């Protein structure tokens, strides 16, 4: 009997948005709150920006708690930021990020000040699914409630799915771009992209 799960490779795109509120005292500063959120990277940004140019937007536009939230890095205008490799760790998969430092407001005496930082993160993870393969997990411990074999091709549209049809897009003739070597594969592939509320998987 087969007990080992079915394993495959997946890619996670998400923006870590951190907004901090700081009180500046006479001789000290204090963190009075830090809101940390994870936002999905839209399909229009995974294909047009990350895969075509290797860059990512410096703004996060997403939906959270039934509201369209927009966040700007360093509270500045929107700009393209190059994806650079993450710092090496032992026994770890490949990863890429744009920002390195957290942004905090400039010191002004006796005020509460807010500051926003957006870090666009791309990660390669291993995904495991077990029988009857109606959902799969990721290396980060986040479940994806959709069959790994779901699609629009050759009767693979009868598989299980728990997400609206707006969140799944299957693109054929996708030419993958390696983010380190900057070399694009020649063989076209069928790529499934799903936008979960907290991250995007491909």
């Amino acid at each position, epitope marked *: 009997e087969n007990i080992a799960p079915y394993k495959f490779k997946a890619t996670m795109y998400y923006k870590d948005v951190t907004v901090s509120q700081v009180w500046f005292g006479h001789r000290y500063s204090q963190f009075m709150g830090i809101f940390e959120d994870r936002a999905p990277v839209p*399909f*229009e940004e995974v*294909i*047009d920006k990350i895969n*075509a140019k290797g860059v990512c937007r410096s703004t996060a536009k997403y939906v959270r708690n039934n509201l369209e939230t927009t966040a700007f890095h360093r509270d500045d205008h929107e700009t393209d930021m190059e994806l650079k490799p993450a710092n090496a760790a032992t026994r770890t998969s490949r990863g890429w990020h744009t920002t390195d430092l957290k942004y905090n407001p400039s010191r002004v005496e006796a005020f509460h000040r807010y500051g926003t930082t957006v870090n666009c993160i791309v990660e390669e993870v291993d995904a495991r699914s077990v029988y009857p393969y109606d959902e799969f997990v990721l290396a980060t411990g986040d479940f994806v409630y959709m069959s790994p074999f779901y*699609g*629009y*091709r*050759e009767g693979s549209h009868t598989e299980h799915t728990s997400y609206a049809a707006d969140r799944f*897009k*299957q*693109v*054929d*003739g996708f030419y993958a771009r390696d983010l380190t070597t900057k070399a694009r594969a020649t063989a*076209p592939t*069928t790529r499934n992209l799903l936008t979960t509320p907290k991250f995007t998987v491909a």
Partner: nanobody
Amino acid sequence: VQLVQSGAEVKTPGASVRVSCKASGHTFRTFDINWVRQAAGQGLEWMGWMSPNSGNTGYARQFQGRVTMTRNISANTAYMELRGLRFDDTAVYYCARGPGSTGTTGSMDVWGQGTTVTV
């Protein structure tokens, strides 16, 4: 995937034409369909894009109101209709897989044989 178009078309001014492009090998619902025309000895002239999965369309500014794109999912076919033809519409027409719903940076990797339309 392979794209095959219809035969040559000969029409009178003021009529309408429907050109069909059928794809083979895939479900036809994973990629968009671009219609682009070329005059005799002239440069390429993009006409429009159509998403066969959702049916959303997008036309050029100079072709708005005269071009209608539709689809038959059962046969995996895409139809493009030009209404109110004139003398300058005589051209070779191509269907391709390119930009649209699947992304605005896509490339027209696969092309059709092209249909000659004479007015």
